[PDB]
Design a protein around this ligand. Structure first.
Ligand code: FAD
Ligand code: FAD
Ligand code: TPP
Ligand code: TPP
Ligand code: VAL
Ligand code: VAL
Ligand code: VAL
Ligand code: VAL
Ligand code: MG
Ligand code: MG
Lengths: 159, 159, 541, 531, 159, 159
């Protein structure tokens, strides 16, 4: 039952915090698919994505609580949640190709960030399912570079 | 000091993020935001990070990073021309009357609503750090619950 | 506290640290001089209350601080210079984190401006140890020293005890500053998780469960509850099984003490577990040497870790036993607890499988029965890792806790002789006896000179056999008796080295013994002689 | 290679590893038995070509593998059992990474299913060592062993040499599988950065100068270049032996404990040829040639710098100079002024033996040809200044780490690597007793190691920082019994059946040193000195 | 139980819907929603429905439905990837002051107004069941008059 | 250190006020790169752009205060500020060229002012960086005429 679980961790700031957090998965030999974090004020919120069993998760999600400077930890993956990814891509765009790719961006509600005759930068945002659909569409175009944030998430407040 | 942006490509071995974050933590530098995700090809990930440093010290740190076996390449972007974006989710405790006021600010920032309860609402925003902090500073009068920032993502523009 | 400096006099950070230790009740530290620790050593000489003990090897220093911390329960301290000093501590910290022993290590570091340059003797000791310690700090400001030191002692002692490390750059040690002894701890996450007092509703449910074939299973978590456990045994009469770490927590001479259980445990204790109906796992972690259910623990992570319990409670076993003792006392006549049938059946097993073991060629188990008899089972015992550790654990009747000092989960060889030094400093007037195999012994034999420097009365019992005995056994048992070089003598001949000469080099009196009929007087001669002594006991391999 | 198994016979991973080592030219390994290494030790006994040497403590093992690797240039190997064994190695790896010595460590690990729980003797040794090794591997599949081992030996030897570690779970060691000796290395980052051959245009641009050489010069071309130039050579504590100490242009050690004339030379030089050096603070308190692109400009910005093996740079420059020597007409007869400084500040020191005389006697009685190992103390500076090394690798010492206890095991490593060499260990009082327990091993191998002990009853070098800076205050630097030589190291030798003697007189010492050199096999000499 | 979606094609003979609804009612299964209308060709109608069942019992029920003379084909869609939509009209009793508040919620949901009186207003909405129930749960404070939900409509996506 | 500074000047009105202001720069041989003003009621607010050293600026920004009818003067260039330019352009537009240029205006959010078969007038507005990007794009089209206002600026109100 390999599954692509997601954990969210809330912390007080110190130098080397990402290195303590990344050590618990490296000690298993487990793989982080994606991780995103930004220091909000005095505190920070991770969202991270990993591949494995729900058994071994109970170990690594317990062992994260032993750290003196973790505030809260949750497995968010089963709960009703807001979930989004930002992706940014640069693609070659010959004047003709410029014609069809315009139809695509005009579909996905994408924005163009800058222009050059050889390539364009596009900003894409939404649910991960739209992200994969986009990737399968861009497959037919000469990509130049791509980068993406990994899924951010927050629980929906039921009454 | 002044803030800098690094973009790194890594050989995507399980546990490699612990090797890289160990280099910064051994210099003591406090990473203010980090994002890691799949690059343009199977078998490579990109890491992007913001650090307070000197443009002398980053030159020493990028030389230092080349000693790692699992980096493919490393760039400072700070002195180059580069496009930049950032994603934020925010949750707010709000009553039906204040909901009006908040929707006004959202409309001004071109923020998209994405969760609602008569207890609380959450907004999605994309842009750059100045609009981020401006918004987070303006919504202080209301019970701001949490902020799931991605950290920046960037690409150089060849133009 | 009485300060050697004016409340407003600026002084070196080193003196700030020393005062912070004195304020914490520090009395003796194990330290080793070197280019990054001179400031601290000088301040330790300006201080008057803290005694300094200089061992021969740094990995002896950390093992003495561990012996001291285990025997007194007080947090042990050790200090060392950067680089090769610090790295030699790693074998200690990895032990402390496995036995939950509180310990604080302090080390000197290169000047801040030199960090990350690969300067002379520079080492990322923080990054090396980060994964084997409860927490570690890099001191970036002298002003935090009071808070850091306080937080450290608290973390070391609070919750599940464990080792902690603080690294201080040399220039910060020299820097002059004004202290501030009043500051709050910044431990919001950890503090919020500290275990709340036990809930009586569960204690009463436990009393309810208290069965027809119950067994008490206790380990290292019971170190601070021997009296409460004895009282509970009165209110119940339940037989007690103890781990290699639980020894001493319950008197070995009591009718209900089944001694050690498990892979090497007594056959009757193992039958008891095999046929029990209610297991009271109080202060245990279900280690594989035991496992190959009611769980009470302070560490919420151990709950359900190895085996899922039917009932589990998070919190100090001490408070849980005091609460249950009151709940039982007010209802003992109503409960009318009785397990005589089970107790008798198990006693029958004791009778059928009692503890047991070729002319003058000494049985070492007899050497240990004699050692118990001639010491009332009251002495402090310390051990290495070979066959000799198992014999000394099985065949000696410990009457109090902390009488048994041994490496539990890590099994570090060379632990004996420096751990005997720690216990000897912590218990000035106790009898300290160190029991070893010749492989476990020789790895730290350089510490014998320290005994002569302190004239400590340590008694050494070398169970000599010219082999790595525990390794040489699993060859002869399973791997067809074939040899991975498990012999440590000279094939051309006699005992090698002549450990008598090793004692002679230190001006320490010693004897060698080879025959069953002399041994009982030889052990008594070692016990009767004032000061240190060595007895070399020659055994068949 | 001759295999003990059929090319298609499935065999235990342990034998796969052993064969992979034999295929790499392994000849002797230092290892210690224990519950996670029994499989490997049993395979090492089934093998016939690789000799096994069992030391008394694992830190002695890693130091012997380092002495062997330093004296032979071959990659050293050591093996140990998990947990306590592995952790004892840390003091070695931290040295190897500081002196750029190639070394490969292999360790046994708990079964895969037990990782993360804190099982008996389990330890995150990979996470502990990650920050202090060139690279390291956790073996997750027996099939990668051939590739992993190959990549490891390559990484250890290629580029700047450095230590590497491989951890193998016990169950993988027992697992039966079919090998595949043909597989490619997966190093796409590292390979792409490997230094390209030097560019002649820079060699020609290179064509009061002073030559400054260090450990990078370990691998004739320099002597030839000195002929084509006649430039005086200054050497570091690591550069010793790379250039004959007896040559007119050898200025000996430079820096903080260096020769006064060499320091003057640097102070007044006009062109510094920093070939194979890293500008260590003991030297520094410009032309740079190095294989390590990271050292370029690290401590001081050079005027010119070249990335690449100094060997090829010297061969290229030697040809460029040879075809134009008569045209260049190089002359610095600066050489005289510095010789005048030699004359003005030459090196120097009743019966209370000078340690420098003990070294001068030992040099002359051994043609300056013997192999020297040290502890780390005052005795390390004396044995560096006063002995005339005539080959590289004659000097074995902890360069950057300064690790005490290094002496005796590094003498063992050198003795195994050079069966017939004269091996002498020159040691501190503190530095000796820290590993005195390894003497037992010498008797097991009957190695003719010669032990010279500069006994002064103190931690000596620290007592110089006391008596120079800290107003001679004793921070317990005295190691004797205040009530009264302690311990009597004669008895220590006697415990091992090793002949020994104690000496106190300047007039006796020359005969005593010769007595140890005359005596076949091992010997101990205890040189009693003033503190 | 769990909900399932069935799509059925039928001969469009007068009174065929009575035969099909008899099969569900003879198992006792309470249909949560149903929508029937003309298919892609003259002479065929499509029925789409939702029922609480087991994925065992739907397999028995689709086998059972093949016994009918007038069915052409029957599909479960529940385990497949399928697109889904739903339409809703809602009426609300509202005064001029509350009208503001309601228009705000409408704007957030992207609801389009479609009838107005100073007594009452009605909105049109399209989407999926979670937004449907969320909206119906949020408008509870006002006198919600009636709701005219279509039931879902679905088609598999071949991608 | 030649730099393209900007100054803003607030005045009470008199006939020939611009002539005094333009004389202080003409006297140095300095260059006004752009200047914009409109009489708001009784008072007016200039914004001007010039090239030179920050040294000589302190002279001319002092000498401007000697005028009796200047109210206030600031160097605005370093401060956090709103900043905008209006540009207007007429370009030849053959029916085919009409096709691609439509894609451009549809990108920059530009408007078309009037039409003729030979040429079109377009209104463009934004930050100067977009203005230069636009110019570099129009370079590939047959411009007929262009005019631009020069940048207007105001300080942002930090709390
Ligand atoms: C060769 C060898 C063989 C061995 N064979 C055996 C054998 O046959 N039998 C045997 O018994 N052992 C054996 N051992 C030891 C065994 O492997 C473990 O190391 C030992 O069980 C560890 O001690 P522990 O289980 O009591 O828990 P420890 O490792 O000592 O941990 C302490 C426990 O106490 C808890 N605790 C701490 N404070 C409190 C509190 N206030 N309230 C409640 N709980 C608290 C902790 O959370 C933890 O669960 C052997 C050792 C060696 C070297
Ligand atoms: C108490 C004490 C005091 C000391 N005082 C002094 C002193 O006064 N003077 C002194 O000289 N030393 C002293 N040392 C030694 C000091 O620590 C340094 O080792 C020394 O200053 C510099 O070493 P190095 O540059 O020669 O070798 P290191 O740089 O330390 O090591 C080898 C060098 O070889 C280079 N290298 C390896 N392979 C190649 C290759 N194939 N091609 C090119 N380059 C290669 C590496 O990059 C590396 O820089 C002292 C040591 C101690 C213990
Ligand atoms: C550092 C280390 N190396 C190896 C081991 C494995 N080991 C456990 S006991 C033992 C030796 C047993 O012989 P000895 O210690 O002399 O006592 P004996 O078995 O003869 O009683 C060894 C090598 C270990 N625990 N720690
Ligand atoms: C492991 C370690 N501990 C401490 C030091 C600090 N130190 C450097 S040399 C020295 C003492 C040297 O004395 P000795 O070994 O007897 O040699 P001597 O000075 O007499 O020549 C010490 C304590 C160190 N380098 N490494
Ligand atoms: C919170 C996190 C980004 C932290 N500042 C670190 O450097 O690890
Ligand atoms: C790229 C990185 C996040 C890697 N997948 C890791 O697990 O270390
Ligand atoms: C398809 C169905 C609704 C059919 N038209 C009927 O009347 O039964
Ligand atoms: C204010 C300015 C435009 C003025 N009216 C002039 O004529 O100079
Ligand atoms: Mg033994
Ligand atoms: Mg000394």
């Amino acid at each position: 039952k390999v599954r692509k679980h997601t954990i969210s961790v809330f912390v007080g700031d110190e130098s080397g915090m990402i290195n303590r957090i990344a050590g618990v998965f490296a000690r298993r030999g487990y793989n982080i698919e994606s991780l995103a974090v930004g220091l909000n004020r005095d505190k920070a919120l991770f969202t991270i994505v990993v591949c494995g069993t729900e058994r071994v998760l109970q170990q690594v999600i317990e062992q994260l609580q032993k750290l003196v400077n973790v505030l809260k930890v949750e497995d968010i993956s089963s709960e009703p949640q807001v979930e989004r990814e930002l992706m940014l891509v640069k693609v070659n765009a010959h004047p003709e190709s410029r014609a069809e790719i315009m139809w695509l961006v005009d579909t996905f509600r994408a924005r163009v960030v800058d222009i050059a005759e050889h390539a364009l930068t596009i900003e894409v945002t939404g649910d991960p399912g739209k992200m994969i659909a986009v990737e399968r569409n861009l497959k037919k175009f000469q990509i130049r570079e791509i980068v993406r944030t990994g899924k951010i998430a927050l629980r929906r407040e039921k009454m | 000091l002044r803030s800098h942006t690094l973009s790194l490509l890594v050989n995507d071995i399980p546990g490699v993020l612990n090797i890289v974050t160990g280099v910064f933590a051994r210099r003591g530098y406090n990473i203010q935001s980090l994002a890691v995700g799949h690059a343009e090809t199977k078998g490579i990930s990109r890491i992007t990070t913001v650090i307070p440093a000197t443009d002398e010290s980053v030159s020493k740190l990028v030389q230092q990073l080349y000693k790692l076996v699992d980096v493919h390449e490393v760039h400072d972007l700070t002195h180059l021309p580069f496009s930049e974006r950032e994603l934020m989710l925010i949750k707010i405790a709000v009553n039906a009357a204040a909901r009006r006021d908040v929707l006004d600010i959202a409309s001004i920032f071109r923020a998209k609503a994405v969760d609602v309860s008569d207890h609380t609402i959450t907004l999605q925003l994309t842009g750059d750090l100045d609009k981020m902090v401006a918004l987070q500073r303006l919504l202080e009068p209301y019970g701001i619950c949490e902020v799931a920032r991605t950290g920046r993502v960037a690409l150089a523009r060849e133009s | 506290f009485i300060s050697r400096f004016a409340p407003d006099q600026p002084r070196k950070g080193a003196d700030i640290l020393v005062e912070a230790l004195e304020r914490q009740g520090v009395e003796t530290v194990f330290a080793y001089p070197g280019g990054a620790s001179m400031e601290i050593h000088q301040a330790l000489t300006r201080s008057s209350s803290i005694r300094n003990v200089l061992p021969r090897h740094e990995q002896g220093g950390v093992f003495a601080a561990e012996g001291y911390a285990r025997s007194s329960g007080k947090p042990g301290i050790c200090i060392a210079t950067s680089g090769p000093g610090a790295t030699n501590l790693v074998s200690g910290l990895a032990d402390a984190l496995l036995d939950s022993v509180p310990l604080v290590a302090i080390t000197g570091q290169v000047p801040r401006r030199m960090i990350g340059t690969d300067a002379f003797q520079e080492t990322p000791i923080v990054e090396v140890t980060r994964s084997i310690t409860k927490h570690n700090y890099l001191v970036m400001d002298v002003e935090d020293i009071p808070r850091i030191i306080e937080e450290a002692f608290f973390l070391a002692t609070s919750g599940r005890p464990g080792p902690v490390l603080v690294d201080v750059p040399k220039d910060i040690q020299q820097q002059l500053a004004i202290p501030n002894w009043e500051q709050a701890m910044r431990l919001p996450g950890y503090m919020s998780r500290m275990p709340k007092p036990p809930e009586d509703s569960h204690l009463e449910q436990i009393v309810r469960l208290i069965s027809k074939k119950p067994v008490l299973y206790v380990g290292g978590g019971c170190l601070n509850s021997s009296d409460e456990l004895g009282r509970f045994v009165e209110l119940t009469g339940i037989p007690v099984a103890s781990t290699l770490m639980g020894l001493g927590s319950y008197p070995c001479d009591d009718e209900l003490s089944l001694h050690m259980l498990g892979m090497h445990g007594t056959v009757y204790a193992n039958y008891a577990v095999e046929h029990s109906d209610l297991l009271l796992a109080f202060g245990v972690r279900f280690d594989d040497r035991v496992t190959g259910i009611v769980h009470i623990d302070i560490d919420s992570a151990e709950i359900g870790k190895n085996k899922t319990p039917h009932v589990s409670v998070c919190g100090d076993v001490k408070l849980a036993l005091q609460g249950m003792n009151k709940v039982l006392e007010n209802r003992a006549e109503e409960l009318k607890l009785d397990f005589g049938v089970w107790r008798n059946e198990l006693n029958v097993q004791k009778q059928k499988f009692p503890l047991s073991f070729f002319g003058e060629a000494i049985p070492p188990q007899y050497a240990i029965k004699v050692l118990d008899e001639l010491t009332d089972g009251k002495a402090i015992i310390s051990t290495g890792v070979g066959q000799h550790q198992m014999w000394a654990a099985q065949f000696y009747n410990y009457k109090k806790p902390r009488q048994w000092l041994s490496s539990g989960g890590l099994g570090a060889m060379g632990f004996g002789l420096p751990a005997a030094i720690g216990a000897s400093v912590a218990n000035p007037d106790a009898i300290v006896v160190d029991i070893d195999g010749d492989g476990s012994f020789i790895m730290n034999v350089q510490e014998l000179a320290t005994i002569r420097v302190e004239n400590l009365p340590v008694k050494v019992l070398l169970l000599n056999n010219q082999h790595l005995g525990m390794v040489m056994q699993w060859e002869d048992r399973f791997y067809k008796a074939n040899r991975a070089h498990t012999f440590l003598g000279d094939p051309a001949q006699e005992i090698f080295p002549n450990m008598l000469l090793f004692a002679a080099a230190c001006g320490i009196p010693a004897a060698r013994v080879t025959k069953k009929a002399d041994l009982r007087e030889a052990i008594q001669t070692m016990l009767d002689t004032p000061g240190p002594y060595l007895l070399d006991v020659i055994c068949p391999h």
